[PDB]
């Protein structure tokens, strides 16, 4: 359970992200695909992309980055009270997209890296730890839904 102060650190940096949702979403997906190429293979939509320059040039990738970060921002702003938001997301990611919880750990690393690069003054160690706790809570709750559905592993 995050404290109120932890949530305030999370949402303070997140309000900075929302000034350029699309640039953040590109940086995060590109970092994910470069650091963990197995993740790119889950996207029939993107797996034709073979270089970082091609990834940066893809408008459809930039669009999907906005989809992803908009969903995550709506979850963070619930400060843990996010059951309604996670149901469809866990369902689609477990049963349609076939995304292991481990790959959610990978994108969480990518999110934290990009926030640190773009917002260092609002992403000191206290805020890094709070955002790690928020993303852990996200993964914990998704993992429980995966387990219900027979996909935790």
Residues within the interface to ligand HEM (CB under 6 A): 39, 42-43, 45, 67-68, 71-72, 89, 92-93, 97, 99, 103-104, 107
Structure tokens at 54: 């091609």
Residue ranges in 50-96 assigned as alpha helix (H): 52-57, 59-76, 83-91
Residue closer to ligand HEM by CB (options 57, 74) is 74
Least distance CB 53 / ligand HEM (angstroms): 21
- State how far the alpha carbon of 107 is from the alpha carbons of 5, 65, 133, 144, 146, in Å: 24, 12, 14, 18, 17
Residue closer to ligand HEM by CB (options 107, 112) is 107
Residue closer to ligand HEM by CB (options 5, 70) is 70
- Judge whether 36 is annotated as a binding position: no
Give the H or E element holding residue 116: helix 101-118
Binding-site residue positions for nitrite:
64
Binding-site residue positions:
64, 93
């Amino acid at each position: 359970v995050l404290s109120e102060g932890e949530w305030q650190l999370v949402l303070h940096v997140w309000a900075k992200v929302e000034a350029d949702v699309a640039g953040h979403g590109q940086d995060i997906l590109i970092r994910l695909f470069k650091s963990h190429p197995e993740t790119l293979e889950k996207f029939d939509r993107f797996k034709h992309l073979k270089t970082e320059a091609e990834m940066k040039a893809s408008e459809d990738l930039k669009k999907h980055g906005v989809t992803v970060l908009t969903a995550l921002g709506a979850i963070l702003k619930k400060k843990g009270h996010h059951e309604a938001e996670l149901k469809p997301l866990a369902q689609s990611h477990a049963t349609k997209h076939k995304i292991p919880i481990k790959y959610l750990e990978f994108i969480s690393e990518a999110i934290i890296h990009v926030l640190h690069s773009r917002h260092p003054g609002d992403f000191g160690a206290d805020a890094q730890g709070a955002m790690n706790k928020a993303l852990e809570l996200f993964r914990k709750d998704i993992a429980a839904k995966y387990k219900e559905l027979g996909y935790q592993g």
